[PDB]
Design a protein around this ligand. Structure first.
Ligand SMILES: Nc1ncnc2c1ncn2[C@@H]1O[C@H](COP(=O)(O)OP(=O)(O)OP(O)(O)=S)[C@@H](O)[C@H]1O
Ligand SMILES: Nc1ncnc2c1ncn2[C@@H]1O[C@H](COP(=O)(O)OP(=O)(O)OP(O)(O)=S)[C@@H](O)[C@H]1O
Ligand SMILES: Nc1ncnc2c1ncn2[C@@H]1O[C@H](COP(=O)(O)OP(=O)(O)O)[C@@H](O)[C@H]1O
Ligand SMILES: [Mg+2]
Ligand SMILES: [Mg+2]
Lengths: 392, 384, 231, 872
């Protein structure tokens, strides 16, 4: 009954909230000033502290040194090099060569080393977040999930169960086969904890020469700096087919990066706390030198799940949608000659859309019939299957 | 604003107004605290004072910053226009939140300390596909098939406007959408009407332009493009005629398939990224679908797959009606004896004949379009 | 305003006072195409009629095109032998309506002005709708794909008007069907090799600029050149 | 726009209203039959909601306004039948015959006589007039005039008839007007109204008892003392009388236990004890009565029918906790939880981030080293010899041997299996803090168990040892879930001793005061006597204010009676630094509601005063009390504090807003949200050592998070700065607190919907103890580890006789449906339809399926789920 009064007491006190907010100050929305009622910290001291007793210590690169006397050699970006000296106020040691340090603008002397170079383009793969997949819903890989987990997590989880026996754990593994190669990788990507990184190798084809190699090198650098890391490789078919080259120099930029990468695991003080898995579309024409033992230990495969895992998937991608409560899902798989669980979820979706088509809520056998026959035979013509059934 | 989203009754009960007057009480109390702090203790104006001292400290010549690294101990390394970097400090008043490598920052003059940041005038590339306005009319203007059309309606418009129906169904909507048919049937125009109805972000670009005379860029272009698209809003991007990149070859291209393959590969990946797929749905439109890489046609990447047929003559009459409604034609219009000329003509041919006949009228400044004009029209437009 | 050169006292960097170019004009200076007008037309008459009908009409009469309720055109395409007036008439056509005469050869020395990287060429549209009474020209395979990238863009999507373009080529039967969509293109025009009267008048035109001798006989010479070209 | 010809209304509906005074006076027949015709003309061609541009409703108010005012007001003799036509034809346009302000003049046409919905049989929409009466006329007719003339004598049964009319007119959202006719009516005396309305509420229907339920309980969550005292027990008996399901008693009537009537709770327990039909709902109610909202229950149900119905008491007392123990032994075995410890591998990249590693070698890190065994081994991650982090430091920081033996209680958290077997090998050592932490674990392990583990059996072996300090800690802690007077008789002379060492007498009131919740003010009297004896002659360190006064409050909490005021506020009326102990219990008794009249005095009494080191302690505790009243706002103040405090105090503080404007959230909840959880980094990404940064330095929340990002970023930037000499405790204790188990996080006083289950008594000491320094290293490891032991944390179960079926689960988000169309929607998180026994879910309500019909709860977090499938 009190509509006008309630709405006006609503909006007028909202306007008063606005006015008292502005009394504080949220307007003058800036180009980089902190929240107006927050930055009052940097008022007198910090201001005249962060600046007056604080100097830049210009970023600086080392060259080499000499014993018994400081006499270090510096290198800087635009200015030349200088025979230089450090600061007593730091330990006289960790300013050795191949390192980035800070040096005041004026005295030209060292104060502190800085982390090695970064190239944030390479920082663009520290995935930082584990999504929400689980080995549960990826069934069928009954003798594959374990085959993975053993050479995937067990040593990290039990860095004793393989040690007292005095045997070294394996290192490398790759996937092949919409069989679920990426899905199985996502499931292994989440559940772990250590520093996980990946690179779509397609993001290495440059326009200059060698750049990809330098990037891969810095990647392995930050890897070795890490203490327990796992790298995943995605669809490296692009990273190089083979050195089949002939006459006219082509594709050479690729194979350069190829060999450079392939060095990065074999002999000559190898990685360490480092294992990996890649996956192909068509392994048919992948490099032999990668297949080499010590790089490519395991060969777990993703084929067509049989009907059993297929039945489990039929459970999986239907147990969260209104359906007939008494369907014989056996026949569903029975009319799934060759497919992926992706296609199972697809048939489910199509049936659901045919349900929401007119009115209903729960599903029927007939919905599944129309979903299958269409998805199967109407969508048969292309179906992308064969040339990968031969992996060619 | 954005005080409390619990205004659930939307009725004339005690709930709403009680919320309102209690927020009134707390607001009066906090405002009076803000008052009483200055009452005995003004100690400054703090309107433009806490800002005056900032301006004082913040270096008068605003030095273009360029973020490359982050040591958030209120001091990180920044560079210069030519890259004469140093290890300047940062301050509290900078809201150290959006710090990112490759950012427009503000540097002090003397010690080059971080005055602040700057927003990005963007983008000399987004605008090129950033949709301006509703370009065309309703689907009702198209007509002719309207069934698979309704299918696309369901697959695209229905989701956003009914984010409940699939929910009672308990299923997220499909992922992929695609058209295919002969040259001139309704794959781009249809998209036009789609956008006409929409209230979401929209872009347009052609696969043909994906190739670059250099090496490797096009892929990265695809990457960052998908990124930017995903970053914005409810959005559906579309590419027309990808098969172009898989059919021809331009000698200006540096290499050949040696980039086609990789680019298309990364492309296909970027629609099935293990990472957050985000709020994106994609349509397709190609003339030669049979010959492109079937790998893209994988279920999950592409879901709704719809044919585009030859419209029927009885509908060709409707197309005639379409492109003849709002023109002051002559009475002699016997459209049927004009429909059957090309036994497999296209809905574009209607517009063709119509506008051509109109031109014929304009040449002689006439108004109503007579039949012999249709004759000459069919003769010109088709016989070559 | 943007593109405003300014004076600035240097001690405290104080912006002090004010001082360039329109980049399209710089482009034109780079090109220096043969600016012309109708007077030098050699035997291109019905051609003139048609090109006028197609180009000038959809500028000053936006009510007529819909008084007819007919869709406006978008592009024009020509053909013929080596040098007959393909660009000659193109320049004049633009000239007699104040169309900012612009062309692109897919070059790069021109490219620095438009886009830093300028991955595509569509970026020229940023200036296209900036000086509306204007036209872009296309000469004589990538020219075809460029034609696609231009045509299919301002196709209802870019409702902006006053933008006309023309490709140039010979033996039209050798280009792609992507330029053969019965609706993708508006109309073409025929440019025949020079015959008697056209040859005579072109002589006439390219003679008046000379200090003749008493008695000329354009007629004889005209009876001699067997239609080699208009050049 | 045609007018004329067919316009009958400018003819017959024009003159007959206009000439009504020309046809009513000295005209008996021409008035009525034509007035009946006008009645039919307005009720026939207008009810069809097709032309709201009625020929009458848009033309008969042109002239018939003054004329109808000449008809009904000015005639004064509208007789029997003609006025049945007047109040049926002059009433449907009467909202439109007048301007907007009808809220005071729904009377002159209608109030002269009520026309016997007859002209509403075929049209849906003067109850506004009855509302006018109740809200203004009845208001100033019975403000202080409870009983008066006709203005109440008829108005009461008029409200009753229109109340029966709410749910009998259209059965649409007009039904939800009965609360809008019962509560605004006689604002305070809601009894005289709902006593009359509930009887009819029994006989109307048994389906609409839920919309009114949620509406009225939102009316009650925040409620005036009179409304909280009356309307609750007026909304209470709905399952008792209106319906026969009766199972909404336990978790929706406990709010009537402490504020309303300390005895109505046990009398309703008796009501349950009378209707024991049959087995399931009885168990459902009695379960939460012992281990999920209150105590003093495990000895309440041992009467003369002790086989399995009354013998359910031993179940609810110990064997329900033991059933959850088998749960945490088998299910937690199944899902992920092993015995233990990778958090040191976690901080492996702390050595290569920017320069040289191997520099952090902190010593007070040992405090967090006891946490590496306490927190990460909570909830049944039992171990053996893994306690080396609580053995080496146990044997190497004298005070640190209690943390190394209080982490053990967290190892076998809430256990009842082997305390007397895991503490034997680490008791006979006679190092004060080893035995202190071990004998305190003798109360930690069996906390909530309250069985024969340490009444006077474990910690009495350390109170015949007055080691002395913690001897009451674990002893009274095992009796937290108890209130047996025997223990208070056992350790009242602790404070009755007035020990020359205050280290025990201080928290003595915290230990003895917790076990009780009600009367017997002997505790309060003896404690205030000892206060004015020793807290008087002191204006120095707040131990006498951090430890002593809180027993008073925690013995008189949760009673909005204001009776405690003139009793205990008058008891600590003393010097200002003793008046620190004045207004605690004053505010200790209004947990979940909104009484902002109480809020303004939390700012009026002392805002800044410019506080020249005068009342910073008293104002810190003022802000502390302000942290209460908001713990359960039913989403009414969750923002109202995170905004008000951030704007006023944390922005404009002297010692309050720089050191005390943060613990608000720590007291509030452990939900997890970008509003206030990331807001603490705002004061935490800036250490600000100016004020005593161990205010800023001083993760108390549960519910494991992904906030590891900025924490580890700061730790990285903490290689050179952010020193560790004392903050090494800080970094990893904070890193261990939230994610102690991945589960065991639901202790934020939101049960059923928000019913308390506290939670409060055992916890309040810590977050009232960090005031401010001097106990971050020495005097704070009595309570930094194992303070709060009131943790009930899983809801999704089957719990039937067999646990045969897995479940029928479909968990969803918080509800927001208040007035909708039937049936009201439940929630939009319907995507996940699984069959898990998963974690509880902070913003969670679970909706089942599989034709179980849920005749158990339908609203208890242990859904027992009776079943029947009479739906073929
Ligand atoms: N065994 C499976 N169980 C459940 N879902 C599966 C299974 N295999 C495939 N899928 C579905 O397939 C989709 C993901 O397929 P991917 O893992 O990307 O395929 P892939 O084998 O890596 O093929 P490419 O490389 O993309 S051509 C998801 O919708 C999964 O649900
Ligand atoms: N079925 C139709 N109904 C009405 N107009 C049509 C129809 N089909 C084509 N047209 C007209 O002809 C134009 C061509 O349609 P488009 O959407 O370009 O077809 P398309 O098959 O995507 O063309 P291509 O193969 O890329 S050249 C439309 O913009 C309409 O003007
Ligand atoms: N019809 C014509 N009338 C006058 N001059 C012409 C004609 N055709 C060509 N020219 C001359 O040819 C030159 C420009 O060649 P143009 O016709 O523009 O080349 P193309 O059409 O082959 O690209 C100018 O010197 C111009 O005067
Ligand atoms: Mg894949
Ligand atoms: Mg098209």
């Amino acid at each position: 009954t009190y509509s006008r009064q309630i709405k006006q007491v609503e909006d007028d006190i909202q306007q008063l909230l606005k006015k008292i907010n502005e009394l504080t100050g949220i307007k003058e929305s800036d180009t980089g000033l902190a929240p107006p009622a927050l930055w009052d910290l940097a008022a007198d001291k910090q201001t005249l502290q962060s600046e007056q007793p604080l100097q830049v210590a210009r970023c600086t690169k080392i060259i080499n040194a000499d014993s018994e006397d400081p006499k270090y050699i510096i290198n800087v970006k635009q200015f030349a090099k200088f025979v230089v000296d450090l600061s007593d106020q730091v330990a006289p040691t960790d300013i050795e060569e191949g390192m980035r340090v800070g040096v005041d603008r004026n005295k030209y002397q060292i104060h502190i080393p800085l982390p090695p170079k970064i190239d944030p383009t390479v920082t663009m793969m520290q995935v930082e977040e584990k999504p929400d997949v689980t080995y549960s819903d990826v069934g069928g890989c009954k003798e594959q999930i374990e085959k993975l987990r053993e050479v995937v997590e067990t040593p990290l989880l039990h860095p004793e169960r393989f040690v007292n026996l005095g045997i070294e754990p394996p290192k490398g593994v790759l996937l092949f086969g919409g069989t679920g190669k990426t899905l199985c990788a996502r499931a292994v990507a989440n559940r772990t904890d250590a520093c996980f990184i990946r690179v779509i190798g397609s993001e290495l084809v440059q326009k200059y020469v060698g750049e990809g190699a330098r990037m891969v090198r810095e990647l392995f650098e930050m890897a070795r700096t890490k203490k327990a890391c796992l790298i995943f490789f995605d669809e490296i078919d692009a990273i190089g087919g083979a050195r089949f080259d002939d006459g006219a120099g082509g594709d050479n930029e690729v194979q350069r990066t190829m060999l450079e990468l392939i060095n990065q695991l074999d002999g000559f003080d190898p990685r360490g706390n480092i294992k990996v898995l890649m996956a192909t579309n068509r392994p048919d024409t992948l490099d032999p030198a990668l297949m080499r033992p010590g790089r490519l230990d395991r060969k777990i495969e993703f084929s067509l799940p049989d009907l059993e895992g297929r039945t489990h998937i039929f459970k999986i991608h239907a147990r969260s949608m209104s359906v007939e409560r008494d369907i014989r899902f056996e026949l569903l798989a029975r009319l799934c000659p060759n497919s992926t669980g992706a296609e199972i979820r697809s048939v489910c979706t199509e049936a659901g859309m045919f349900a929401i088509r007119a009115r209903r809520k729960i599903a029927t056998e007939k919905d599944f019939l129309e979903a299958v026959n269409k998805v199967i035979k109407s969508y048969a013509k292309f179906s992308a299957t064969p040339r990968y059934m031969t992996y060619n | 604003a954005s005080k409390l989203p619990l205004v659930t009754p939307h009725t004339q009960c005690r709930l709403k107004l009680l919320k309102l007057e209690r927020i009134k009480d707390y607001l009066l109390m906090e405002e009076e605290f803000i008052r009483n702090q200055e009452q005995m203790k003004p100690l400054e104006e703090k309107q433009e004072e806490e800002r005056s001292k900032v301006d004082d400290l913040r270096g008068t010549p605003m030095s273009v910053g360029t973020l490359e690294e982050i040591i958030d101990d209120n001091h990180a390394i920044v560079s210069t226009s030519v890259g004469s970097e140093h290890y300047v400090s940062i301050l509290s008043f900078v809201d150290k939140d959006l710090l990112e490598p490759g950012c427009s920052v503000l540097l002090n003059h003397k010690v080059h300390a971080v005055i602040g940041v700057l927003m990005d005038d963007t983008d000399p590339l987004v605008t090129v596909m950033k949709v301006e306005k509703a370009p065309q009319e309703t689907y009702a203007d198209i007509g002719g098939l309207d069934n698979q059309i309704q299918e696309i309606k369901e697959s695209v418009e229905l989701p956003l406007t009914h984010p409940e129906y699939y929910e009672e169904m308990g299923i997220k909507p499909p992922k992929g959408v695609i058209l295919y048919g002969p040259p001139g049937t309704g794959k781009t125009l249809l998209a036009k009407a789609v956008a006409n109805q929409t209230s979401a972000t929209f872009l347009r670009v052609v696969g043909s332009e994906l190739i670059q005379k250099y090496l490797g860029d096009g892929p990265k272009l695809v990457r960052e493009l998908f990124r930017v698209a995903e970053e914005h809003a409810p959005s559906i991007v579309f590419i027309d005629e990808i098969d172009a990149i898989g059919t021809k070859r331009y000698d200006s291209n540096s290499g050949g398939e040696r980039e086609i393959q990789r680019t298309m590969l990364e492309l296909l990946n970027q629609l099935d990224g293990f990472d957050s797929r985000g709020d994106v749905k994609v349509i397709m439109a190609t003339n030669r679908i049979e010959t492109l890489d079937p790998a893209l046609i994988r279920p999950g990447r592409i879901d709704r797959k719809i044919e585009f047929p030859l419209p029927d003559e009885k509908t060709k009459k409707r197309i005639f009606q379409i492109h003849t409604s709002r023109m002051t034609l002559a009475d002699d219009v016997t459209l049927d004896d004009l429909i059957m000329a090309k036994d497999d003509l296209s809905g574009a041919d209607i517009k063709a004949i119509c506008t051509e006949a109109g031109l014929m009228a304009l040449r002689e400044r006439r108004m109503k379009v007579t039949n012999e004009d249709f004759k000459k029209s069919k003769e010109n437009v088709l016989y070559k | 305003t943007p593109n405003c050169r300014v004076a600035l006292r240097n001690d405290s960097y104080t912006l002090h006072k004010i001082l360039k170019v329109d980049p399209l004009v710089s482009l034109m200076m780079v090109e220096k195409v043969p600016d012309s007008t109708y007077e030098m037309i050699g035997g291109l008459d019905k051609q003139i009629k048609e090109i006028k009908e197609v180009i000038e009409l959809p500028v000053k009469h936006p009510e007529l095109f819909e008084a007819l309720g007919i869709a406006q055109p978008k592009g024009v395409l020509l053909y013929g032998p080596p040098g007959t007036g393909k660009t000659l008439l193109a320049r004049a056509v633009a000239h007699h309506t104040d169309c900012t005469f612009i062309r692109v050869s897919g070059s790069e020395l021109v490219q620095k002005f438009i886009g830093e990287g300028a991955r595509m060429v569509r970026e020229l549209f940023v200036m296209a709708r900036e000086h509306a009474p204007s036209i872009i020209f296309m000469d004589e395979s990538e020219v075809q794909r460029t034609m696609l990238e231009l045509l299919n863009q301002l196709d209802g999507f870019e409702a902006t008007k006053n933008i006309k373009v023309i490709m140039a080529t010979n033996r039209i039967d050798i280009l792609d069907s992507a330029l053969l969509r019965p609706g993708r293109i508006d109309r073409k025009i025929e440019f025949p090799p020079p015959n008697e009267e056209a040859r005579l008048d072109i002589l006439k035109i390219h003679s008046r600029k000379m200090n003749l001798t008493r008695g000329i006989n354009l007629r004889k010479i005209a009876e001699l050149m067997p239609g080699a070209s208009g050049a | 726009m045609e007018e004329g010809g067919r316009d009958k209304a400018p003819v017959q509906p024009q003159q007959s209203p206009a000439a009504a005074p020309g046809g009513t006076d000295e005209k008996p027949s021409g008035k009525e039959r034509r007035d009946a015709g006008d009645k039919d003309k307005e009720q026939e061609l207008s009810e069809e909601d097709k032309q709201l541009q009625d020929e009458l409703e848009m033309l008969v108010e042109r002239l018939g306004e003054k004329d109808t005012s000449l008809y009904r007001p000015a005639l004064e003799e509208l007789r029997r039948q003609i006025r049945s036509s007047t109040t049926s034809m002059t009433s449907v346009p009467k909202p439109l015959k007048f301007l907007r302000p009808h809220y005071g003049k729904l009377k002159e046409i209608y109030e002269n006589m009520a026309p016997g919905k007859r002209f509403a049989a075929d049209i849906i929409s003067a109850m506004t007039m009855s509302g006018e009466r109740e809200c203004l006329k009845y208001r100033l007719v019975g403000s202080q005039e409870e009983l008066a003339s006709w203005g109440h004598e008829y108005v009461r049964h008029l409200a009753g008839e229109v109340a029966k009319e709410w749910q009998e007119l259209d059965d649409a959202e007009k039904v939800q007007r009965e609360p809008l006719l019962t509560l605004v009516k006689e604002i305070v005396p809601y009894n005289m109204a709902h006593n009359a309305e509930h009887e009819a509420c029994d006989l109307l229907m048994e389906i609409e008892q839920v919309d009114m339920l949620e509406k009225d309980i939102d009316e009650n969550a925040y409620a005036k003392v009179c409304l909280y005292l009356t309307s609750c027990v007026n909304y209470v008996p709905e399952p008792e009388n209106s319906a026969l399901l009766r199972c909404a008693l336990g978790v929706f009537r406990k709010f009537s236990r402490f504020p309303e009537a300390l005895r109505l709770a046990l009398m309703l327990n008796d009501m349950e004890l009378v209707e024991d039909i049959f087995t399931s709902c009885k168990d459902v109610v009695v379960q939460k009565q012992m281990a999920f909202m209150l105590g003093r229950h495990g000895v309440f149900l041992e009467l003369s029918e002790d086989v399995e119905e009354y013998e359910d008491l031993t179940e609810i007392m110990s064997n329900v906790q033991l059933n959850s123990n088998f749960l945490a032994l088998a299910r937690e075995l199944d899902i992920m939880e092993p015995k233990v410890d990778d958090i040191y591998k976690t901080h492996l990249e702390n050595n290569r981030f920017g320069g040289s590693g191997s520099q952090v070698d902190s010593a007070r890190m040992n405090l967090a080293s006891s946490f590496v065994n306490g927190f990460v081994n909570a909830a049944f991650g039992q171990d053996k010899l893994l306690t080396d982090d609580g053995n080496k430091w146990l044997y190497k920081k004298d005070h640190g041997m209690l943390s190394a033996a209080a982490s053990l209680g967290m190892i076998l958290l809430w256990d009842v299996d082997g305390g007397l077997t895991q503490i034997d090998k680490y008791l006979y050592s006679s190092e004060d803090y080893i035995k202190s932490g071990a004998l305190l674990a003798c109360g930690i392990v069996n906390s909530g168990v309250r069985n024969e583990c340490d009444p006077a059996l474990a910690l009495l072996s350390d109170y015949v040892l007055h080691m002395r300090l913690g001897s009451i800690f674990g002893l009274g802690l095992a009796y937290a879930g108890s209130n047996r007077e025997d223990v208070l008789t056992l350790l009242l002379p602790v404070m009755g001793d007035s020990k020359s060492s205050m280290e025990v007498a201080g928290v003595t009131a915290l230990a003895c005061g917790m076990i009780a919740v009600g009367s017997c003010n002997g505790d309060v009297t003896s404690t205030i006597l000892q206060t004015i004896m020793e807290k008087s002659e002191t204006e120095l360190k707040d131990t006498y204010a951090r430890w002593l006064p809180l027993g008073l409050g925690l013995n008189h909490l949760g009673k909005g009676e204001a009776i405690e005021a003139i009793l205990a506020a008058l008891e600590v009326v003393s010097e200002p630094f003793r008046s620190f102990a004045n207004t605690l219990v004053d505010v200790c008794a209004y947990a979940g509601s909104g009484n902002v009249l109480k809020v303004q005095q939390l700012l009026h009494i002392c805002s800044e005063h410019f506080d020249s080191k005068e009342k910073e302690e008293d104002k810190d505790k003022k802000e502390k009390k302000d942290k209460d009243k908001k713990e359960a706002p039913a989403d009414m103040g969750a923002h109202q504090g995170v905004a008000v405090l951030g704007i006023a105090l944390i922005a404009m503080g002297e010692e309050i807003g720089a050191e005390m404007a943060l613990r608000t959230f720590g007291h509030l909840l452990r939900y997890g949200e970008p509003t206030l959880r990331r807001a603490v980094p705002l004061a935490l990404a800036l250490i600000s050592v100016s004020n005593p940064r161990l205010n800023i330095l001083d993760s108390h929340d549960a519910d494991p998070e992904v906030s590891y990002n900025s924490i580890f970023a700061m730790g990285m930037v903490g290689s050179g700065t952010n020193n560790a000499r004392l903050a090494a405790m800080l970094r990893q204790l904070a890193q261990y607190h939230a994610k102690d188990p991945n589960n065991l996080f639901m202790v934020r006083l939101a049960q059923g919907l928000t019913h308390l289950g506290k939670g409060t008594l055992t916890l309040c000491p810590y977050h009232s103890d960090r005031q401010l320094m001097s106990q971050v290293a020495v005097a704070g490891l009595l309570t930094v580890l194992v303070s709060f032991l009131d943790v009930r944390i899983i809801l999704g179960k089957s719990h039937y006789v067999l646990y045969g079926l897995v479940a029928a689960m479909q968990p969803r988000m918080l509800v927001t449906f208040d007035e909708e169309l039937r049936p009201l929607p439940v929630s939009v998180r319907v995507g996940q339809a699984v069959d898990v026994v998963g974690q509880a879910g902070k913003p969670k309500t679970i909706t089942g399926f599989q034709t179980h019909t849920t005749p158990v709860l339908l609203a208890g977090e242990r859904a027992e789920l009776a079943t029947e499938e009479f739906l073929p």
